[PDB]
Structure formats: structure tokens, C-alpha cells
Design a protein around this ligand. Structure first.
Ligand SMILES: O=P(O)(O)OC[C@H]1O[C@H](OP(=O)(O)O)[C@H](O)[C@@H]1O
Ligand SMILES: O=P(O)(O)OC[C@H]1O[C@H](OP(=O)(O)O)[C@H](O)[C@@H]1O
Ligand SMILES: O=P(O)(O)OC[C@H]1O[C@H](OP(=O)(O)O)[C@H](O)[C@@H]1O
Ligand SMILES: O=P(O)(O)OC[C@H]1O[C@H](OP(=O)(O)O)[C@H](O)[C@@H]1O
Ligand SMILES: O=P(O)(O)OC[C@H]1O[C@H](OP(=O)(O)O)[C@H](O)[C@@H]1O
Ligand SMILES: O=P(O)(O)OC[C@H]1O[C@H](OP(=O)(O)O)[C@H](O)[C@@H]1O
Ligand SMILES: [Cl-]
Ligand SMILES: [Cl-]
Ligand SMILES: [K+]
Ligand SMILES: [K+]
Ligand SMILES: [K+]
Ligand SMILES: [K+]
Ligand SMILES: [K+]
Ligand SMILES: [K+]
Lengths: 322, 322, 322, 322, 322, 322
């Protein structure tokens, strides 16, 4: 297959986390398929089809844990596949790929904006909010509540090992929001003063568990301990269809040199191993609501998002498979 | 008062954390009084007395949270004071200071060794142990259990912001113990596989609460959640006598540039504040036992350590005061 | 607009709580709109329409917390509105208002009878039931259980500040049911002997939370502590649509003189403030079942009742707005 | 009136537990109706219909608690009733019973295999699984995990008074799975080493509660204490439709001679009573997932299974009543 | 036999709660013995001793639950009994009663002031404190925190049926402290904004349980839920020695006309009963500290206070029995 | 050394559980040493001393878990030893052994009677008491409550594998107490109707944990869930000294053939292992009180009983060692 350089560049940037955040990654994958379609030099439909299948696999094999990425590839490829099997000519197949990618991308932006609006209504004037990592959907909530005139303060946890809390502190401060930055370890210490916890998600499972940046589950635990609301801001494409049929979500283990830089780690003795899980699992009992672009739900209604938006496709192979 | 340079050097090193760990700091303070006494050029008892009072205040005013430091200054100064008020001549007063310092120091070493022995009996072959920060008393437990032939593995949490888990990982690996190093955020994720949690203390209060490096309380919380034993290794001089009469332990807030280096932090916008608490409070309900050099106790018997070893002195002013 | 006096009297009696109980208020609001339509001297459908809009707003701005009231108003006005925009003439629009009102009222009555029948099957012979405030839905359950020949006793909590428990005690006693009256403070003390807790609702939110008379959340809390079933008897028009899109329910703050009579309160020092919340929020974790006229649900299925019955209207404005 | 011996023999065996297990009992009841219809000497439809009603009542009145039984009877008899009332002739009505009976049995067998496949995806290599009683649905899960090459071990509880763990132990060992057999009392002692709990169900109610062999609720309770996943393997026909309208599930009290054999019990004084409940109720807070043939659900989605699949029948009397 | 009117008047007032509060009642009983001894016309010791026994029994039989009362009586009468039995003459025995009575009263006053001083150190600037009933020991804590210049605010619960919160509110407001008065039912609603709970005690038992005004256990329960410190202010004579040997504390059931006044209650049907428990039991898991005149203790150290101070008397009958 | 046959028979009967119950074993071990001393044909004190040492070791190496046994052995041998090292002659050493044994036995009997009297005061008329295994201390409590005229009923759990519940049921029934026998699995199901749980102990550790018959921790767990008082009746010689210095109590693993008779177990597949723990560990959080012969304590005061009575001996070796 004649795969275009932008597909490989995208895959590499996803892998290395030059591009990151579950939504963003997913939009990047749809964008990559769009560019494979736009630039294909294929002359028959079967040839374009094969490129998009191959491009999809390349993209899918980058980072496993956030289901947004496969859900985006599915969104495009279900549509591409049905056009192809229905006899679509080259330019029709090309345009189905391009347009389906465009749709996912546009709907993703609209979903994140609407999560903002919906979530902002649960934020109250004076609230102190704690967050974790850097989630565009969580930030959309905080930014919108501030734009409505509510005087909020956000506590941002450092989010080791990649220091994602620095991204979030700078972003929220850029909008004029007062920020407090703390190490991850201090989240219990400051939970007494916190009014609301607002975090994102990478995957949400059929039983209502939320998989999100390493450390989410500790914050959610002590929030629950302290009767602080835990709200998860998450697009419908963060919900994980394969978990309806028993699949476990893989926790990505990333390079130990993200924790301890190479120059330092090579001096350490052989009997120290560094483990670097990028995500943990928060059980539904410590989540009060999930805020999707279609509304507020209890975590136990994740199964209904799934049943109604995704369950149909479970009969079939992945749309990129042979 | 003619205070000797070693007293100021000690105080500065305590303040900057060149010297750290609650036990160590306390031994350093006793050592500083010893050196003030050894080198004093005072000619009358009243003059030496005044130097030791002043030296004590200098030492006490360095770091507030670990009560080991004042308990060490008390150990020396109660004895110095009673000698002085009893009519002691210069050389007798000098020697009371020197010998009392020596005693605290020697007893501290013996206490930590014996905590090791006692605590090692609760560690079992095959155990996975999680720890936090760098505590010589906790390390004494782990090292001794390994010396008895038990195959253990220790999970060491990074302990931001000062990276104290690096000290501990290297130390335990140096003794031949297999170590796993994780960021603080991953402590819940790995609590399922952990058999025992072993941590130190800076102060232990009359109601049984343990004050220890920022993050201790999150680990203890999720340990309890998972029915993992939480054991606190702590010398009798980590117990906090003033809490018997209602005193609150001050949580040291340290420089924000320990979290975010100056070069970086000065570029950040004014509306981001960095908060850097060095300690948190773990409630007794999440501690199973405290291991002291006199035995195992439930956290609710802290009041008995206090009543019996320290309560006598509560009638009186601090022995360094006027 | 020529609003008839029954609309003003009804609003006044709601505000003053001369008429109270979430279902009863809702039937009264429907009954007011019915009377506006019956007596209107409008000649034009535009005129009647404008009256019913204004009557609606008058009724809506009485008490904020029980969503039964706006749900009644919507039941009548979604239909009046659809008729008006469809070109209904005067008599058709009038009958639409009058008939929609009567449908609401009749359904409300049936729904309470049916909640009785359903909930009674969960009451067992010999049961001690604790209740709170005065809820016709809850009373329907207890009364029906008694009519079935189950030997029950009901513990009635006083329900300060308005003493709603007195209403309940006398109503149940007049059906022949043995009653124990206690102060609200004694709810924990007698939860040991209690088999079941049966309470009503004013609003039920998307996430499963129940808003009911002040003190409900405490009884639910301690019931849960003691493993005593907490059953909320509540008609589907107690479910709150706007919470689907993130709205917080306003907690009504009533006059301090309802707590401390005027005559006594004026003698009190100025630095005393009396706070009088008429409702609190019981989280879904402390609720076993909601008994609706369509059946038993877990609290987390509240979002389903909302999606099924109310979701469709959230894209539109209020059916009494310009 | 003319009931074949196989109906009576099936009944007698259900009742004596010569045939037991909720699914198996349901299949036997469908079979017994099948055989009645095959062998009926009836000449007219009404006469066949009367036989099938009376047979249904005989089989319904064997054992109360497992809803699988009446659900099987309903499956056959709803379809039989509709053909009788729509005018079917003798052979059409015969065939409808036979074939409906066959469909239930086949669907039961496929549902157990599918539960296996879905549940096995939740089991990981190296897992220690605790189970209780003997459930073909739970065994299907464990069996399949093993066939996938996962190295698992199963802790089988004895399950007094009938010793159903013996069955489970021998069965799992015959497939190749190593087993640890313990008394019921030791379930907490071994919950520390357990990774997963997998049990079956007799009836699952509208609020998410699972009714299963005596002691299930204890294992679920300490599993929750220990953060061990509780998985319930259960077909859709284990869901109890009458609970949607408030029905309490009857817990079967079995003969005390299954606890203490007659010989011994007759020698005991009159003031000892032996109580022998065959089932207990596990509340949904202690269940993480139910694995059905349709997928994984939180227990709070039990109501959705009931609504989609069984609600419709609740207007109508039992399809075997006159 | 010759009992002065002041003993009977003191008794009558204790009983009617014209004099109430556990400490105050104890001081009154000591006073009443004092006055009996002052005014006795007895000529021989035996005759004085008989009067003091009979007076003691009269005062003991007023109100059961607060152990302060019999502890005051014992304080005086142990010392009186020992002087009578050691042969004291009339005036020596008179003086022993008078002076023992004076010592109890003075020690009570000093104990309340010291509790204040110790507890106030637990209150921080800006704290919202919730209290319940009217306790001079808890008020001493709050009063002193305010005198130290801490800006605090107190949430006072109403405390039905006797309205003791009115007393507390007015008293605290007179000292300068701002007060929020709420009904008992609203305690959970406002627990989110509360920093500390400070209540008193009538009896504290050997296992750490605190018996205090009806509703205390509810506030303690939701405080724990919310991680709000529960502090009990209580003198050593609130500790209940008979509980060391297994005695259950009697909970006083007071007249139903304090709940519903006679006028109203006589109009109620016979099948309503009003139950009026004056106290409940808070278990020690819901108490963080007891503040005594001797220091702060965990509630599990109640046994130590009992052992040191009261155990000795448990061999002997009551010092007022024949 | 010439060990008499009663020493060997006693050890054999302990090992086989022909004699069982922690108190009874302890009295039997004392009784054996008594018999060794009575019948010894030693001529020299060195000779008798050596016999009693060897008898002691034989008795100690029977069953490990109940510390009552070594505590009995120590009671006798601390005294025999002190006499020997003090130069006691043959007859003096013999009488020291015989008299120390008789003191142990008499005190044990008194202690159980006294535990009965104390614990009975915590039992109330109408109470349903659940017990587990067969404990003479627990039975002392129930029996005394009945003798006081309290109308109680006792739910007796079967206590597999040895059926110790049958012993209990028949013993209580023969005193006239109504008994309900249930399987261990039914403990949760009947905890609703239970007022109090009364169980014994084999060992109690420094941190407050109770080691008792397998299944104890489960009953305590669910009692705590249901807020049912958990009361452990236990003599001070059930308290375990070595736990003060970090020792873990060994859990006795008994023969698998006690669970599955030999005749049946030999037919079972090789990949089934039967595990038979005779005890489990109940954490102090699930225990309300320990009833000792010296009084009621919270579990966290176990360290006090140990410090008071046993601490002094921990610096010395076992009084039967070389
Ligand atoms: O989609 P949005 O809301 O931006 O992010 C969702 C989540 O994805 C990110 O993962 P990573 O940094 O890519 O590993 C973070 O865990 C974040 O919470
Ligand atoms: O006395 P050891 O057991 O060495 O240490 C006790 C505790 O003191 C240290 O504080 P810091 O690093 O001085 O702030 C850590 O918090 C550690 O756990
Ligand atoms: O609709 P029904 O079941 O009668 O009552 C529902 C609830 O509404 C009432 O409020 P209020 O007395 O109007 O403030 C009470 O809170 C009651 O529980
Ligand atoms: O249908 P399957 O999955 O085989 O079994 C489900 C349940 O039915 C059985 O009841 P019984 O032995 O008939 O009383 C056991 O309780 C078992 O868990
Ligand atoms: O001794 P002080 O601290 O004043 O009061 C302690 C307690 O005694 C009172 O009882 P009552 O009003 O006499 O029934 C209240 O329960 C109060 O909390
Ligand atoms: O000393 P007493 O109160 O009689 O019994 C105490 C405990 O010792 C017994 O063990 P075993 O039957 O010897 O294994 C039972 O566990 C019982 O609860
Ligand atoms: Cl049920
Ligand atoms: Cl009590
Ligand atoms: K908070
Ligand atoms: K673990
Ligand atoms: K109850
Ligand atoms: K486990
Ligand atoms: K709070
Ligand atoms: K109970």
C-alpha cells in the first residue's frame, strides 16, 4: 500500500505524545485518513480501500488505552466500508473518507463546546475546583463557568511523569482564571477546601469505570471520602464498545525514561525497575456524574450510551480488517 | 551570646534540607548543642547556660513540623537546666550538655535498630512492600526483613517535590533489595499487588494521627481501602507532647521553587500560585500499628507513649525559655 | 392580561404553604389554569393564549424546588401551545387547556393510588416503617399495606419547622394505623427497630438524587448505616428534566419567622441569623428504590424516566415563554 | 386432568433437588411440557390446553425462588396461549408447545456458552477465582478462561448444607483446572489472595439485587471489603419481572433434615430449631457486573433487561391461569 | 429522716429540668448535700450520716442518664463515709461533707475553664463550628477561641424538644460570636460548610461511647461522613465507672407533653404514642477527640480515665447505701 | 527425662482435639505439669526441673494458635523457675509446680464465671444473640443472662469443619435456652434479626485483633455492617505477649481429612487441594468490646492488658528453655 507520509508522521507523533489528549489524538487520526484519501494516487476503489485499511491499522497500533482513537477510525471506516461494498466508484469512495473524517472532526469540536455549557451549570460562584492532567473537555467546563462571571479558582495537580498540569495551569491562567498548582501527593491535603473535582477520560467502560491519566483514581477516592463531587467531562466517543462484550482495557506502559531521564537512569543499579503506567481505573462508585455532549448521566448509564450508539457494530469485524 | 559557627551551619543545613529526615535533624540539633558546649569560651555557668538557651532557640526556629527536633533539644536542655538550677559549676554544666547530647544520639541509633527488629517480624517471605519518602526507621524494617532471608520487593514512590524516593530506591538497592520505582500518582494502581505499607513519621499526635511527608495520607487511605496493612515506624521522640494539651501541629510550607525551578517559575503568569506543603496528616483510622523501639501499638495508644514519657514536662516552660 | 382571581389566590396559597405537598401543588397549578380557561372572556385565541402564558408565569414563580409544579404547567401548556400554533380557534384552545388540566389531575390521582399498590408489596407483616414530612405518595404505600391486613406501625418524625409530622400522625391514625411520634433528632436512635423507611420526593435529578423535605438526607444516611431499606415514593412528574442538561435544583430558603416566631425573633441579638432551607439533597447511594406509578426503579434509572418522558422538550423553550 | 408421569416425576425431582441449578430446572420444566404435548391423547385443542395449564401449575409449585422456572413456563405458555386463543387446531397447538419448549432449551444452552465467552474475557492469566455453590453459568466462564490458556486456580467453597462445592470442585478439576476447596467460613480468610469472585444467580430483581445460594451475600460483602471484583454469570431468564411491580422474592426454607440428618435430629431437644434458608439476597452495591448472554451490565441495569424483555407481560395474568 | 427543704427543692428542679446541664446538675447536688450538712440539727454523727445518705438517695433518684450526678454524690459521700467509719465526731463529719462538696464545685468550675483553654487550641481562625444542645463545656471552648481573637461562627442546632439551642444561640451571641440557628434536620445540609463539631456529654462509657442530648449521634454520623472533626468537651466526672463492669447506661424517657403540649396532646387519638428519649448514644468510631481537664484523648482512652480515677470504688457499694 | 504418661496423653488429646477450647486446653496443660510434679521420682531439684522443662516443651508443641496454652505453661514455669534458681529443695520445687498449676486452674474457672456476670449486663431482655464455635467464656455470658430471667434466644452457627456448633446448641438447650441452628453461610441473612454477637477468643494481639475459630471475622464483618454489637468474651490469658514485640500469630492448618473424610478424599482428583485453617483474624474495627474478668475494654486497650500483665517477661527467655 502507498501510504502517505502524513499518516506515518501522525502515527509517530501520537506514539511519542507530541500529539496527546484523547480527543485530539482521535481528531488527528481522522485527519490522517482524510489526507490519505485526498492525496491517494490510487486509480481503482479496491486500491484506495486497501490504503485506508492499512492506514487505519497503522494509526490504531500507536497507543492502546484511549478508545477515542479507534472510535474515530471506526466512524470513518464504517462509512467508507459501506460505500465500498455498495459499489462506490473511486471518487465517491474518496469523498466518503474525506467527508466522514471532516464530520468526526467537526462533531468532536461541537461536543467539547456543549460539554462546557452543560458542565458549567454545575459549577457555582466561589467554587474551588480540582482537576488532573490536561483534558480539553474538563477545561471547557472551567472556562465556560468563568465566562459566565462565576469567581472560581482551579487547583491543578502536577500530573507526573509528563507534567501535564503545567499545560493546564498555563492554559487556564491565560483565560484569566486564578490557578493553584500542587504536586499530585497534596491532593488529599487540599480536598477539604475543594468544592468540585472535574476531570476528563480516555475510556469509559460498560460498567461505568473511567480510565484516565495515572492518578485520577486517587483523587476520585479522596473526593468521595470528603463528599466532594467528582464530574467526568467526556465525549460519547470516549465510551468503549468492546467492554460490553467483556473486553478489558489495556493500560499503556510507557518508556521508563519518561520518569527518570536516560542520563540519570543508566547510572542506577540493575535491581531497580521503573514502572510507568499512563492510566489508572476509577470505579464508578467514586464518580458522581459523566457529562457528555448529550447530557448528564450517572456512571451506571454508560452502558446506555454504548448500547444505543455503538452496540450495532459489535456483530461485525473492525471495518479496517480483512 | 557567643554562638559557635557549627550551630549556625547546622541551623542553615536543616533549613535548606541539606540535612533531613526527622531523626537525623534531631541528632544534628543535639550534636550542635554538644559542640556549643565543647567549644564555649564562657567562664561562668550563667554564660554557658545563656549560650545553650540561645543555641536551642536558633535550632528550634529552623523547621517546625517534625517534633523530633524540639524533643531532642528538650532531652538535652531539661538536664542542662536542672544541673544549672541545682548550682552546677561551669565544667559540670558543660559536661551535662555534652553527655546528654551523646545519650540522645546513641539512644536514637539504638531505637532505630530495634524498630527494625520489631517491624521485620511483621514482614513475611514473598511480601511486596510499598513505602513513601525516605525514612531511616522504615528502611530499618525493610533491611532487617531482607537480612533474615525473606524475599521481598519494595515499591518506592517518587515523593515529589524533593524526589526523596530516589534516595530510598538507591539505598534499598544498595543492600540487595529489588526495588520498583513509581510516581506518587500510581500508588492506588499498585495497591492491589502490595502486601504491606511501611512509612515513617515526623510527628505523632495524642489522638493517634501521623504527620509525615506530603502524600502519606493518600497512600494510607487507599491501603485501608484495599485492606493492606499500614505500619508506621517511629521512635518515641516522634510523639508530640504539646498535642496532649490541644496544640495543632504546624504544616511547614516550603519555597515554591522546590516545585517549579526559579528559571521556569519567573516566566509564569502572576495568577498562578504554587503551594508546597511538606507534610500531610493521616488519621489514625488508616494506620494499623505504630512500631516504636518499645513495641507495637495501635495508633490510639500514642497518648500512652506521651503520658508516660513526656506529660511531666507540660507543667513547665520550654527548658530553653527565660 | 385579565387574570382571574383564582389564579392569584392559588399562587398566594402555594407561596404561603396554605396548599403544600409537591403533588397537591401541581394539581392546584393545573386547576388554576383550568379556571383561567373556563372563565376567560377572551374573544380571540391570541387573547386566551396570552392569559394562559401569564397565568403560567404567575404559577411558576411561587415555589422553586418541587419540579412537580412546572411539570404540571408544561403538561397543560405544551398542549395548549401546540393547539394554538396549529391554528385552533377560541373554543378549541379553551377545551385543550381545560382538558389537558383535567388529564393531569386525573393521572396524578391514579399515579398515587398505583404507587400505593406497588410499594405496599414491599411492606411485610409486622413491619415498623419510618417516614418523614407528609407525602401523599408515601402515605398511599402505608395505607394500602394496612388495608391488605399487614400489622404495621409507623414512626412519624415531627418535621420541623412546619410540624408536617403532626399532619402525618393524625392522617395515619385516622386510617387505624398505630403511630409513634418522635422528634427529628431521634431518627438514629430508633433506626435499630425500624424495618423500612418510606419517604416522598419534590424533585429527582438525572443522577438519581432526591430532593425532599429538610432532614430527608439524614434519615436516609442513618438508614443506610443500619441497612434499612430506603424507599422513595414518587410520581414520574417528580422527575426533573433540566437536570439532564446540567441544571442545579434551587433549594428554597423560607422565612426565618417560620422557625422562630416574629414576636420572639425580634428580641434576639442581631449577630444571630436563622437559616431555613425547606429541602435537602439525598444522594442516590442512600436510596434503595424509587417507586413510580410505572414500577420500582433503582435511583440510577432516574435518567431513563427523564429521557423517555421529558427529553424531547429540552430543545424547546418553556411553553409559556415569548 | 390427564397428566403424563414425566410431569410428575420432573416435579418430584425438582422438589427433592435430584434435579437442581436454576437453568437446569428451567430446562427440565420446558422438557416436561414438551413431553406432555408429545404424549397427550387429547382429541380437541381445549383438552390439550387444559393439560398444559395443569402441568404448568404442577411444575410452578415445586420450588419458588429461582425465577428461571416460571420464566421457562411462561416462554412456552405465552406462545401456547396465543395459538389456542387464535384458533389453532389440535396439531398446531401441540407443535407450538413442543417447539416453544425446544426453543427455550436451545436458547438456554447457547446463553450459557455465550456467558462463558463474554465472562472469560474478564479473567486474566494467573487469576485466583473464588466461586460458591455450583452454577453452570459461572463454570462456563471459568472453563472457557482455561481453554483460552489462562492459568487460573479456583477457590471453591463447600456450600453447606447440600455440599454443592464438591460438585463444583470435581467438575472444574476434570477440565484441568486446579482447585482449592475450603469451608464457607474461610471465604474472608482467603479473600486477600483472590483476584475475582464469579458466582451465579437464581433471581435478579428490578433494583439490581441478586438472589443466589445461601452465603453468596457474605462472599460478596467481604469481596467488596477487599476490592475484589464480584461478577455474577446469569442468563436473561434469571431476571425477575414481578419485582418491577414491587413483588418480594420468596426465599425457600428447606427441610431441616438436610442440615442435621433425621437420625441425629430426632435425638435433639425440642428447644433447638434448625432453620434452612436455601438462598440469600446480595444487594447491588456488592456486585460489580452481571454477565448475561447479551453483554456485561452494571446491576442497576437489571431494570433495562426487565423492561425490554419482560415488562409487556405484566398487564396479563400468568399464561397458565384460567 | 430530717431532710432540709433545699434537698427536696433541688431534686424537684433537677427533675423538672428547671436546673439542667450535666455539670450544673452535679454542682447542684453537691450544694444540696452541703446545705443539708450546714443546717442539720443532728446531735450525733450517726444521725448526720443517716441524713446525708437519705439526701443522697433523694438526689440520685432524680434523673438517671448523666453520670455527673452520682459522681458528685460519690465525691462527697466516699469522703463522708470514710470519716464517719474512722470515728469522726459530729463537727468533723459536718465539715467533711461541706468541704468535700465545696471541692467538687470548685474543681468543676476549674475543669470547665481548663477544657476551654485546651479545646480552644483546636479551633482555628475562620472556623465554622457546629454544636448541639447547650453544654457549658463546649461553650467554654468556643468562648475562649473567640477571646483569643479567632474569627469563628457557630451553627447552633435547635435541639428539640426543649429548644436548648435557643439558650446556646443567645449565650454565644452575648459574648460577641456570630451564630447561625438551624433546625436539627438541617445538620447534614450544613455539614459541607462546617469545619468542626463541638458538643458536650452526659456520660462517657468504658468503650468510648458518648451519651449526650438526643440527636448528637446523628450530627456525629454525618460529620464523620464529611470528614469534619467531632470534638467532645467533657470533664472527668462525665466518665461512667459502672460501665467498666458491663453496666448499660439508662436512657431517660421524658414526659410526652414536652414534645406535644398537654392541650394539643389530649385531642389526639389513642393510637398515636409520643416517645421522648432525652439522649442518644454516639459510638466511638464517630468521635475524634474527647477534651477533658486533663488533656485531649481518643475516645478509646475513656477506659484509662475510668481505671486511674474511678476503678478503686467498684469493689464497694455506693457510699450512700446501708 | 522420665515423663509420666499423663503428659503424653494430654499432649495427644490436645493435638487430636479430643480436648479443645482455648481455656480448657490451658487448664489441661497446667494439669499435666501438676501430674508430672506429683508423680515424679526425681531425688534432686535439678532432676524435677529438667522434667518440667521437657513436659512443658512437649505441651507447647501441640497446637500453636491459642496463646492460652503457653500462657498457662508460663504461669507455672515462671514460678517453678524462680524457685529453682533461688535454691529451692525438691519438695519446695514440687509444691511450687503443683500449687502454681492449681492457682492457674482455679483463676481460669473464676475468670470465666466473672466474664459471665460482666457480659450478661450487656445482654437485654428479648435479645437475639448470635454466636459462633463453642466458647465457654461466651456461653458463660449467655447462660448468666438467662439465669437473670432475660428472655433470650441464641442463634448457633454450625462451625464447620468440626461442627462445634452442635456442641453449643445442645449445651445451651440443656440450660433451657431456646436455640436456632443455622449453617455458617446463613450468618448474613439472619444478622438483621440479631441484637448482639457474643464470641470467644484464642489469641488477642497487641493491636486489638482477635484470632478465633474460622469464620469469626465474617460474622464480625457483617455484624459491623448491620450495626450489631460484637462482643468477645476472653480471659486475660487469651492476650498474646509476643505480639507486643512484632510477632505474628501462626494460624494452625489442620488435616484436610477433617474437612473431607479420608474415604471420600482419596477418590478426588489430584488437582484439588483441601485447605483447612482452624482460625482467622478479626480486625479491631469490627469489635465493640472485649469482656475480660477485669472488665469491659475497647479492643485497642488490649496493649494495656499486655503491658500490665505480660510485658515484664519479654526481656527473658521462655521459662522452659535452656
Ligand atoms: O480528550 P481530553 O478531554 O483532551 O483528554 C482526556 C484525557 O486524555 C489524556 O491522556 P494523554 O495525555 O493523551 O495520555 C489525559 O489523560 C486526559 O484526561
Ligand atoms: O526519622 P526518619 O524515619 O528518617 O524520617 C521520618 C520522616 O521525616 C522526613 O521528613 P523530611 O524529608 O525531613 O521533610 C520524611 O517525611 C520521613 O518520613
Ligand atoms: O407530593 P407528595 O408525595 O404529597 O409530597 C412530596 C414532598 O413534598 C413536600 O414538600 P412541601 O410540604 O410542599 O414543602 C414534602 O417534602 C413531601 O415529602
Ligand atoms: O443456573 P446455574 O448457573 O447453574 O445456577 C444458579 C444457581 O442456582 C442454584 O440453586 P439450587 O442448587 O437449584 O438451589 C445455585 O444457587 C446456583 O448458583
Ligand atoms: O455539662 P454540660 O457541658 O453543660 O452539658 C452536657 C450535656 O448535658 C445536657 O443534658 P440535659 O439538658 O441536662 O438533659 C446536654 O445533653 C448537654 O450536652
Ligand atoms: O476458651 P473458650 O472460651 O472455651 O473458647 C475460645 C475459642 O477456642 C476454640 O478453639 P478450638 O475449638 O480449640 O480450635 C474456639 O475458637 C473458641 O471460640
Ligand atoms: Cl426481594
Ligand atoms: Cl451503654
Ligand atoms: K471539600
Ligand atoms: K493488596
Ligand atoms: K433496623
Ligand atoms: K485480593
Ligand atoms: K466541611
Ligand atoms: K440486627
Amino acid at each position: 500500500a502507498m501510504i502517505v507520509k502524513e499518516v506515518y508522521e501522525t502515527a509517530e507523533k501520537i506514539k511519542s505524545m507530541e500529539i496527546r489528549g484523547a480527543g485530539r489524538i482521535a481528531r488527528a487520526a481522522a485527519q490522517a485518513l482524510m489526507i490519505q484519501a485526498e492525496k491517494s494516487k490510487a486509480k481503482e476503489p479496491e486500491e484506495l480501500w486497501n490504503e485506508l485499511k492499512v492506514a487505519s491499522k497503522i494509526l490504531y497500533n500507536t497507543r492502546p488505552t484511549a478508545v477515542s482513537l479507534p472510535n474515530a477510525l471506526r466512524y470513518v471506516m464504517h462509512r467508507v466500508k459501506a460505500a465500498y461494498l455498495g459499489g462506490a466508484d473511486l471518487e465517491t469512495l474518496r469523498f466518503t473518507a474525506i467527508n466522514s473524517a471532516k464530520e468526526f472532526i467537526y462533531n468532536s469540536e461541537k461536543a467539547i463546546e456543549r460539554i462546557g455549557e452543560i458542565g458549567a451549570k454545575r459549577i457555582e460562584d466561589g467554587d474551588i475546583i480540582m482537576t488532573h492532567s490536561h483534558s480539553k473537555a474538563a477545561i471547557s467546563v472551567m472556562k465556560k463557568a468563568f465566562e459566565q462571571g462565576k469567581n472560581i479558582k482551579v487547583i491543578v495537580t502536577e500530573t507526573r511523569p509528563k507534567w501535564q498540569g503545567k499545560i493546564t495551569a498555563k492554559e487556564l491562567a491565560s483565560y484569566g482564571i486564578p490557578v493553584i498548582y500542587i504536586v499530585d501527593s497534596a491532593a488529599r491535603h487540599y480536598m477539604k477546601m475543594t468544592d468540585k473535582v472535574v476531570m476528563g477520560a480516555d475510556s469509559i467502560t460498560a460498567n461505568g469505570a473511567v480510565i484516565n491519566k495515572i492518578g485520577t483514581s486517587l483523587i476520585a477516592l479522596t473526593a468521595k471520602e470528603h463528599r466532594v463531587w467528582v464530574m467526568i467531562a467526556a465525549e460519547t466517543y470516549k465510551f468503549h464498545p468492546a467492554t460490553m462484550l467483556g473486553q478489558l482495557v489495556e493500560i499503556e506502559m510507557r518508556d521508563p525514561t519518561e520518569v527518570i531521564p536516560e542520563e540519570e537512569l543508566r547510572t542506577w543499579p540493575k535491581n531497580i525497575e521503573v514502572w510507568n503506567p499512563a492510566f489508572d481505573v476509577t470505579p464508578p462508585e467514586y464518580i458522581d456524574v459523566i457529562i457528555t455532549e448529550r447530557g448528564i448521566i450517572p456512571p451506571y448509564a454508560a452502558i446506555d450510551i454504548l448500547k444505543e450508539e455503538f452496540g450495532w457494530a459489535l456483530k461485525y469485524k473492525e471495518p479496517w480488517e480483512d
